[PDB]
Amino acid sequence: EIETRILDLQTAVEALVRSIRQLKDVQDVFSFRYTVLRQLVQTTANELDRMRKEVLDISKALVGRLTTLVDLLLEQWLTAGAKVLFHLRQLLKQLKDMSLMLRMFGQGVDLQNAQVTELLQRLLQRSVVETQPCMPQTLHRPLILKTGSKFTVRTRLLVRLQEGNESLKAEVSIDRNSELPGFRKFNILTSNQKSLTPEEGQRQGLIWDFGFLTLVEQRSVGAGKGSNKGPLPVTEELHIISAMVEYVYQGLKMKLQTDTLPVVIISNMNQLSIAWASILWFNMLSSTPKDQQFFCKVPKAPWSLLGPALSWQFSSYIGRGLDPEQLGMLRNKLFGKNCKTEDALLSWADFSKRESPPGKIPFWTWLDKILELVHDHLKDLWNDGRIMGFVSRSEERRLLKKMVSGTFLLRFSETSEGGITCSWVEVLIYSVQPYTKEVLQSLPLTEIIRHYNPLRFLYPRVPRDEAFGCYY
Amino acid sequence: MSYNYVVTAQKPTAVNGCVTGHFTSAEDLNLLIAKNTRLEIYVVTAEGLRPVKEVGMYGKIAVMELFRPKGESKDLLFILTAKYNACILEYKQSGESIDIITRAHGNVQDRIGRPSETGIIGIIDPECRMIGLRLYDGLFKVIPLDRDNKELKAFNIRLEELHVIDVKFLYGCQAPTICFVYQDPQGRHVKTYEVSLREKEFNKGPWKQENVEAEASMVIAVPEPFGGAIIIGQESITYHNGDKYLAIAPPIIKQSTIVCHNRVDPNGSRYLLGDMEGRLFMLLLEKEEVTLKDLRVELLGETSIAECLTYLDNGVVFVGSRLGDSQLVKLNVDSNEQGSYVVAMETFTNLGPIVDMCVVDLERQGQGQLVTCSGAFKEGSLRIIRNGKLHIRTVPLYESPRKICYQEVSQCFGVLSSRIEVQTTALRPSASTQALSSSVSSSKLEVEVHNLLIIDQHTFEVLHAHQFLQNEYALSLVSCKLGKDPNTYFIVGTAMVYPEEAEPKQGRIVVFQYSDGKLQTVAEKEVKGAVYSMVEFNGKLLASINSTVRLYEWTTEKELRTECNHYNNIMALYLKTKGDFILVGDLMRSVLLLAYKPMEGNFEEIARDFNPNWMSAVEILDDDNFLGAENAFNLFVCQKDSAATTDEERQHLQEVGLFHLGEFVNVFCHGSLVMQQGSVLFGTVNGMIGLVTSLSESWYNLLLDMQNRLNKVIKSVGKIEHSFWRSFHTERKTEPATGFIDGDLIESFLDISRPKMQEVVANLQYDTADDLIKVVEELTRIH
């Protein structure tokens, strides 16, 4: 019962209110014995004690059932669950005021009320950063900020309840506890507030989209350059952006704190490719929003984690994700063509600084240059599947010896920094010069394949007239 | 629908009030008797009073003032309309013509405020510069008295004291200072306040508050020379020129408290006083060589319970008694057993208050007489009013007249009475002492016990003063046939009300029979508590009691058993049975229509007036139209609305006919003042004999537009709109009268001028001009 275990809890708590309205009646005549001119005084006293016994017994069973609903965890589950605990505080507040006339009974409601406010402080904090902090200028590299520019972040909670007319004002604080040596200070120089109207909360949700958040170039008060650029560089420094959530509902003053994921803030725009490599290396080995000392110690990640991590740079950016056939050549270009193991612990320094043979190009600079050239000319030949993508010369020269003659393929050149190249077999496999984006600017590769005839059947047998027919 | 013609046969004779002074001239004294709906000017002559003209007014006079302001030769009459409309009146003459004009005009009605049950106190300051009006408890309205002020406007001064007993002015002082007795839970006391028109507030007066008795009520103003304030409570008569205390406490005053007073001497040495019994008193102020030296009292004989006294010339005092007839009393030097230094100079007639009456034509053959039970106690007299035209035969009973019915087996008049006896030796010689036979009731199941005193029709002598037991008080009396016996039994609903109990729990309805001079008892039917007015339903005795309305069946074995059990009623104060419809008049449930069913045995609730109005008198005209009177002087005729849609609204009586009357109806009757389409008569307290004539549909439209076109032509003194006045004083709804024809206005056309007749008949062409002059004479020939 993923959707029924919440609706039945509404009438379950309301069933106790059906006996509370009748309990007040027995409590009213009990107080009527004040200054009576007396055998019925003791009769109502013992009757009220037995009538207040089943009220506290069944209420304890509903407490344990509400705790199991939170341990299961989508948004609609805590919607109706929060309204149950909200109206529950209305029947115990009037019962505590009515038990002050010597009812033993006043202490029985305090132990049950303490568990209500304790569970409310557990589910509210548990309830999240939907929209990750990303800049509008970033294309497919989120979690990257810049000094002087603005960014947005949404800490929307699953709860969809708000007060009648109370605007839940919340704030976003950046760089308040992450002032450790190696981290720079960045403070918003403009309003960091969010006026959450009740209307947009009871029907949409507690959306706290903090927008227009500027940044300043500042350092630590007492230690500037060197201290903040030592253990952690500008491109590799983590900054946790806190968010003080203030939720008020019938005197329930709570000041939550939903910490977002650590981001990297740079002081320039040319260092966007290097700063993005530090983010991918952080969200791969772990996924914790609180981290201070992560890049101080050199990490070692195997190839099992770099597989699906690199596929997000083409699936979201262009469209087609990295197939397992493309990931087979990235391991050989970093460790060796005759590699047999897969648990090779790759360090962080060997990801953007170690050159890749035989091209003598670093791994990060080679992949970044590939996605840049194909995003302006090869965008229509990647998504549909006209090319295979990253294919090394060791594996390309093996499959061509088992096919027929006259067929050609389109892969990526490894001797250059990227671009496009062609190869065919007539046994002998030919090769052409790698064409960069400068050649495709005056004329794309669509007319090059047609008007060239060695090119006939595109991998494997697709005629050059049917594959590139829609691009003419 | 419901169209009725309300016309009066006789003008109200009860003296509501009187004020004397030089109204017409500067040397001619004039007694302006301010009665109900009229103000009559009387020239003080050697023969007494000389009427010149009676100027009619809209309703009663709340405040009457006859004062001459600085720089005036004619008394400025001040009349306050009952709808709180103030207007300054001025006497005007142009050749011995009575034409009172109007100096100023302005309404003083307030939307909110608790009305003073004691009364609206209207007084004028000795300097004649402001108007002291006490409209509500704690709300004083003062109107600036200016020579060039035509719009009367009164500002609200929040009197600090919420409730006050009596407000007066300090005569003798050179400032606008007042002397008023306020009412507090800690005790009533007197205080002085200054009405300064420059600050529009009350200010500390000459002296501080004074500790008086906790019973002091009437406040008598001390004239200019003496100075100070005389306050008479239940007994003590205190004097307060300044912080001086001169209180005399005559034991005789303790019993009969002082109600009215009169200033004989302008100095203030001789101040005539009036108690609640009629005994004439007179204070003796001697100026100590101005401070008072001593204070004495004397007895000047007993009169009819008075209300307003005015001093005339040559030692003449007008006794404006409301209970009983008013007599001009001339102060003389004569002395007798009671030391009455007064004589009865003149005697005027009075008809109210009419407690009960009936139309009997035994020797009248039509044109039945009106046996009005006027007056009370010693003034209780059966004025035999008979049309010739109206001859009045006073029958003094010296006892309070209660209920009177018609007996056709002995040609007499059975009248209930409650004489007053000091706790029990008698005080006044009532008709019981002058009766022929006296006996007490058989069964047993200061003081005013009920006694049955049957009086003859021709001899006017009490044949049998059959009194009842101690603590036995009757409330109803039925002298009609009961069952198959044609003898008019005397079903008297008496009650054993003990002086120690607080709720009615014991009672005994006895039945008697008058047989040739003998009051012989039949049987008795003890009940629980006090019963109300009952009317025999087709002979069958229909009981009233209080909340339970029953129907006692008369058998042949001398036994009266109940047969109904109606509990919906709360009070049967005004129970009437007509045909099959049983109309019970409740105080709060108003009109309730019932219907007896022999197959069931209970009165079924069919119609009920939805308005919760306080009833005063009911009357059944037809089977669908029923006239009802309210305590706020308003008439209303409801129609049977039992043919609607929803079953809930079918039990609601639709009130369409609505009228603004003005008089308080106490009892209804059936008859006319002409021998051999309306014969509805009723007796009022003010003494107005009224006739309701059920007009037809063709005759209602003939006077509908005629009355509306006459309100803008014939106006009263003050340019007051007639239709505006014709509005109800009902708290629930203040509305103009709808569905009735005011006879008073129609009467004005008989004595109207000749050219004024064409101004109201030219806009009507009955299928006209001269026809409207002849058809109005038939409306006055029926009484």
């Binding site: 019925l40 009648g164 007492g222 | 009070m571 919760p612």
Partner: protein, 559 residues
């Protein structure tokens, strides 16, 4: 001696208007020479100080430090004379203060607040700083601003129109308890007589259905008077009610002659109806006609009408110490009556509560009806005399850039209906003030700059403040740090224009009790939120930076 140096943060960017106020009222410190007048003798022994940082400023003279942010200057405009809806002004600053006390109220009796009678006595006491003809137009706004926080303030803390809505919901729950008498065994034909008192049968006796409007007319109370007395003669017979039974029995007999009842009965007691009380707060209302309730002790009746005349029984219902009132009874105390059981007496007790709650429902309704007319009397009289003063200012300005804007807006305030309906007329009245171009001598720009000077402890315009402004002025610095009451203009009240109508006050907004659970609670300690610091600062304590130090303009002129 005991100086104070502020510190302004660079947050909230830079506005062109804020730069003129700071340059003309604040001085930014840089090095040590510009701050040597306050005793800033820094010894260069501190490590952080020597590291090029301005930290560890050594001070010979102790002072006070304020962490001021620019955000607080943007909020200052909502804390000045012209704040939420205040008038633009020497005494106008103190006017805004006392006006916030009327709005920010936890549970104080709404009757204690100044009503129309005393408000006028203060209207002529307002003072202004530089024309004389323009002072009447500025003062003509506070006469209607008092009704914005009460009359026009629907669903807000301690308000008269919003208090009616709570009485309707409480009257419905009260009738549900009296119909549960028979249902609940603990609480023959006795269970059917109580059902007649319910409004389901009372409204049927007149001809109107049972809705949420029949319990507000004056004719409805006349029908319930007959059903109350019917429970006192059948269900009860105690010696207390028995005395009043003989009074109504002899009253109908004294009416046969047309006379009243003199002082004859000596064993009579002070009944509840003959209680002469009046609301001291209300200028003029008249003696209240108290109902003829019984079953009350003579010592408990005097204390009931004491609070009625003063606080109309509000504290025992909504306010402080409300738990002790439920032990005895908010509408009527738990009295004892003989010849009745604990269930018999309980029935007639709930019927007497509805007889008093319905009577009190018409009292609070009528008191505001009279007040809506009392406020309309001074409003209609003010617009008749304020339009004449501004008319003479136009003729004098013509005979002698803001001349044509006066005659075009002087006739726009004459087309208002001023009656309901009347709620939309007040929204367009404040719009004419913004269209009137004030001269440079008296604008809002200067008023805001002057506000900050009064907030500091080195400058003060007025020392004495009214009692209402005594607690009200504590809310001015509150808004500067965090503005609780934001700009409440005409536009916002237009959308929720709940006119003073029986079919609008009860209906309309129904789910407004959620914010009231935290509204009153918040106002309890809202008068103690003032950002101020007075701790002494030593050489190595409270170390900040010299460049961030800010001082007022009046501080440099005093040295």
């Amino acid at each position: 001696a005991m100086k104070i140096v502020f510190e302004l943060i660079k947050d909230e960017t830079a506005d062109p208007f804020c730069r003129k106020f700071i340059l003309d009222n604040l001085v930014q410190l840089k090095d040590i020479e510009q701050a040597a007048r306050f005793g800033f003798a820094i010894e260069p022994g501190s490590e952080d100080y020597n590291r090029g940082v301005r930290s560890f400023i050594r001070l010979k003279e102790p002072y006070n430090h304020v962490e001021l942010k620019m955000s607080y200057l943007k909020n200052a405009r909502f804390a000045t004379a012209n704040g939420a809806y205040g008038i633009r002004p020497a005494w106008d600053s103190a006017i805004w203060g006392l006006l916030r006390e009327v709005e920010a109220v936890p549970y104080s009796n709404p009757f204690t607040f100044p009503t129309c009678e005393r408000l006028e006595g203060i209207l002529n006491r307002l003072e202004y700083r530089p024309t004389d003809a323009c002072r009447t137009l500025c003062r003509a706004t506070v006469a209607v601003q008092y009704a914005i926080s009460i009359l026009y303030g629907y669903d807000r803390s301690a308000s008269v129109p919003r208090y009616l809505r709570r009485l309707i919901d409480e009257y419905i729950d009260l009738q549900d308890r009296i119909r549960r008498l028979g249902i609940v065994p603990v609480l023959g034909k006795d269970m059917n007589i109580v059902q007649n008192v319910l409004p389901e049968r009372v409204c049927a006796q007149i001809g109107i259905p049972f809705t949420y409007e029949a319990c507000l007319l004056d004719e409805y109370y006349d029908c319930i008077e007959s059903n109350i007395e019917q429970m006192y003669d059948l269900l009860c017979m105690c010696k207390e009610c028995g005395m009043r039974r003989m009074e109504r029995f002899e009253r109908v007999r004294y009416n046969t002659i047309g006379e009243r009842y003199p002082k004859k009965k000596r064993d009579r007691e002070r009944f509840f109806e003959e209680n002469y009380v009046i609301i001291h707060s209300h200028p003029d209302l008249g003696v209240l006609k108290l109902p003829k309730i019984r079953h009350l002790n003579p010592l408990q009746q005097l204390m009931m009408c004491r609070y009625l005349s003063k606080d109309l029984l509000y504290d025992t219902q909504f306010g402080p110490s409300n738990a002790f009132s439920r032990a005895q009874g908010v509408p009527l105390p738990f009295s004892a009556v003989q010849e009745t059981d604990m269930n018999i007496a309980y029935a007639l007790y709930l019927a007497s509560n509805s007889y008093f709650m319905c009577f009190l429902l018409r009292c609070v309704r009528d008191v505001l009806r009279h007040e809506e007319e009392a406020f309309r009397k001074l409003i209609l009289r003010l617009v008749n005399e304020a339009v004449e003063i501004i008319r003479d200012d136009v003729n004098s300005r013509v005979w002698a850039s803001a001349e044509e804007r006066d005659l075009a807006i002087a006739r726009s305030l004459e087309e208002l209906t001023f009656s309901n309906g009347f709620c939309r007329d007040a929204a367009r009245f404040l719009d004419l003030i913004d269209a009137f171009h004030f001269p440079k001598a008296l604008r809002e720009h200067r008023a805001r700059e002057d506000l900050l000077l009064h907030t500091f402890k080195i400058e003060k315009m007025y020392d004495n403040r009214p009692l209402s402004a005594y607690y009200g002025d504590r809310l001015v610095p509150y808004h500067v740090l965090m503005g609780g009451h934001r700009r409440r203009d005409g536009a916002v009240v237009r959308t929720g224009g709940v006119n003073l109508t029986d079919n609008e006050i009860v209906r309309g907004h129904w789910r407004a009790d959620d914010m009231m659970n935290a509204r009153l609670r918040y106002f309890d300690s809202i008068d103690s939120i003032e950002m101020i610091r007075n701790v002494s600062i030593r050489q190595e304590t409270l170390m900040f930076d010299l460049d961030r130090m800010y001082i007022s303009r009046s501080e440099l002129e005093s040295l």
